[PDB]
Amino acid sequence: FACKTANGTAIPIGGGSANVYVNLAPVVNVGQNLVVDLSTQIFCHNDYPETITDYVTLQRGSAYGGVLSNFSGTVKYSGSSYPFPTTSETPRVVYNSRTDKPWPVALYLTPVSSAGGVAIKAGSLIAVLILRQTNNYNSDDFQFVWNIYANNDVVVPT
Ligand SMILES: CCCSCCCO[C@H]1O[C@H](CO)[C@@H](O)[C@H](O)[C@@H]1O
Ligand code: NI
């Protein structure tokens, strides 16, 4: 089991960590969502699907910088919705193919009432999402840690 990002980097067998940049709508009002869809960027696959079944959860989602201070959020993982930052590990998604399949995580962030001005800075760390991977074959229990960075400033109209 391993993961990579679209035109980007890879995390190899056994787990590890990688930095991911995201495009964000440059202006967002109170009552609107920033939708950060990671499923177009993070792709994983199973290395021996004929004999092994891989299990993948979102173990935790944390907020950082302007997201932590200026937004409230939910995370959508494989069709279900949860508070972001998260309160517990999600159920599992099955990976059973050598073919790249997306990691189905999306963040919906909405500006808090105190948010105003540049609420997220270009280049800043905004989130960490931890993918946890196990199987039906051995004791493997690995973490794939995704550091999420803002590509552009996001302004909350005052
Ligand atoms: C015919 C199979 C012989 S075992 C091959 C061991 C390879 O294990 C890697 O690949 C497995 C399947 O993706 C993972 O479950 C495991 O965690 C690790 O990433
Ligand atoms: Ni592979």
Please report, for the domain that includes residue 21, its CATH number.
Answer: 2.60.40.1090
Provide the domain count of the chain. Answer: 1
51: containing domain: 1-158
Residue of 152, 147, 154, 158 whose CA lies nearest to 110? 154
Which one-letter amino acid corresponds to residue 124? S
Residue from 135, 141, 143 to probe ligand 1 pocket by mutation (most atoms less than 8 Å from CB): 135
What resolution in angstroms, rounded to 1 decimal?
A: 2.1
CA 18, CA 145: separation in Å to the nearest integer? 6
Of all protein residues, whose CA lies closest to atom 16 belonging to ligand 1?
Answer: 1
DSSP symbol at 28: -
Q: Positive or negative, the Cα torsion across 41, 140, 83, 125?
A: negative
- Which residues, in sequence order, are bridge partners of residue 54? 95, 135
- Closest atom, ligand 1, to C-alpha of 45: 13
Of all protein residues, whose CA lies closest to atom 18 belonging to ligand 1?
Answer: 1
Do the beta carbons of residue 111 and residue 30 sit within 8 Å? yes
Residue from 47, 51, 144 to probe ligand 1 pocket by mutation (most atoms less than 8 Å from CB): 47
CA 18, CA 6: separation in Å to the nearest integer? 12
User: Residue 62 has which token pair?
Assistant: 């944390």
CA 140, CA 14: separation in Å to the nearest integer? 8
Which one-letter amino acid corresponds to residue 81? S
- Backbone conformation region of residue 47, classed left if phi is above 0, alpha if psi is from -120 to 50, else beta: alpha
CA 69, CA 78: separation in Å to the nearest integer? 27
